[PDB]
């Protein structure tokens, strides 16, 4: 038995992202997995890191330091509840899938705020206690990304450079940092430009990949994997 959390960042249920999220729910549910979706836009998820995220006495109420205050709020249990709700889903999950359209070579801000606010010190990492010693060790994570640009544009030579370049702050800087083993990204290139048939193909490929997800090895999440040479 496995638990999966899909952190989903798209405004439109009818989108190609919505379809990728739905096929993931359908296929994982079919296998008998436990499935949870955090539909960030539907939740009106708060993306800003503010003093509203701590409800207790501040450690230093004259100079606000978000990192310090949320680490302390975590240990004390005075974090805002929207944060702790997400931490419970993550804590219980064996696999976390992030489903989102690429926005400026990165995640939409609403999903960036989920990372900023949910993956706090004490919960996701400590100092020391990061990368291979991250607190979410033993967990899997997978970025399922859609793009405006074609596969060709995301090669080394390559108007945008290699797709793996923009994956670094996310796969390595965030997921590996917190101790996840990172599965290979699912990148569904340029659905807006693609045929009906090619879109159906991309959706079907994701579905079919999920059938055997539990048998995959993670990627070696390193500079060499991301940048080569």
Ligand X SMILES: CNS(=O)(=O)c1ccc2cccc(CCNC(C)=O)c2c1
Ligand Y SMILES: Cc1cc2nc3c(=O)[nH]c(=O)nc-3n(C[C@H](O)[C@H](O)[C@H](O)COP(=O)(O)OP(=O)(O)OC[C@H]3O[C@@H](n4cnc5c(N)ncnc54)[C@H](O)[C@@H]3O)c2cc1C
Least gap, CB of 153 to its own copies (angstroms): 11
Closer to its own copies by CB, 76 or 106: give it.
Answer: 106
Partner whose binding site includes residue 176, from Zn ion, ligand X, ligand Y, none (CB under 5 to 8 Å by kind): Zn ion
Binding site partner of 153, from its own copies, ligand X, Zn ion, none, Cβ cut-off 5-8 A by kind? ligand X
44 is in the binding site of which of ligand Y, its own copies, ligand X, none (Cβ under 5 to 8 A by kind)?
its own copies
Paired strand residues for 191: none
- 89 sits in which H/E element: helix 81-92
Residues 122/71, Cβ–Cβ less than 8 Å:
yes
Selected binder of its own copies within 23, 109, 187, 194 (CB under 8 A):
109
53 known member of a binding site = no
**Of ligand X, ligand Y, its own copies, none, which one does residue 125 interact with (CB within 5 to 8 Å by kind)?**
ligand X
Q: Are strands 140-146 and 186-188 parallel, antiparallel or unpaired?
A: parallel
Q: Which two tokens stand for residue 228?
A: 């080569």
10 binds Zn ion (CB under 5 A): no
By residue count, the chain amounts to 229
Known binding residue 123? Answer is no
Check: CB of residue 191 under 8 Å from CB of residue 148: no
**Residue 131: both structure tokens together:** 């990368």
| Shortest Å, Cβ 20 to ligand X | 16
Contacts (Cβ under 8 Å, ≥6 apart) of 182: 140, 141, 142, 171, 172, 175, 176, 218, 219, 221
Instruction: Summarize as ranges the residues that interact with Zn ion (CB under 5 A).
Output: 172, 176, 221
């Amino acid at each position: 038995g496995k638990k999966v959390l899909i952190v989903y960042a798209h405004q439109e249920p009818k989108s190609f992202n919505g379809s990728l999220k739905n096929v993931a729910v359908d296929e994982l549910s079919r296998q008998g997995c436990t499935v949870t979706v955090s539909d960030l836009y539907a939740m009106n998820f708060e993306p800003r890191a503010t003093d509203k995220d701590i409800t207790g006495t501040l450690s230093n109420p004259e100079v606000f330091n978000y990192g310090v205050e949320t680490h302390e709020a975590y240990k004390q249990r005075s974090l805002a509840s929207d944060i702790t709700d997400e931490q419970k889903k993550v804590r219980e999950a064996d696999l976390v899938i992030f489903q989102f359209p690429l926005y400026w070579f990165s995640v939409p801000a609403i999903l960036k705020g989920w990372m900023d606010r949910v993956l706090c010190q004490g919960f996701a990492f400590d100092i020391p206690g990061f990368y291979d010693s991250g607190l979410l060790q033993g967990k899997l994570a997978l970025l399922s990304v859609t793009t405006g640009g074609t596969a060709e544009m995301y090669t080394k030579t390559g108007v945008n450079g290699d797709s793996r370049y923009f994956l670094w702050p996310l796969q390595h800087g965030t997921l590996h940092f917190c101790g996840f083993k990172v599965l290979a990204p699912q990148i569904s290139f340029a659905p807006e430009i693609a045929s009906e048939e090619e879109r159906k193909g991309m959706v079907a490929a994701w579905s079919q990949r999920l059938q055997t997800i539990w048998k995959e090895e993670p990627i070696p999440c390193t500079a060499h994997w991301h940048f080569g040479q």
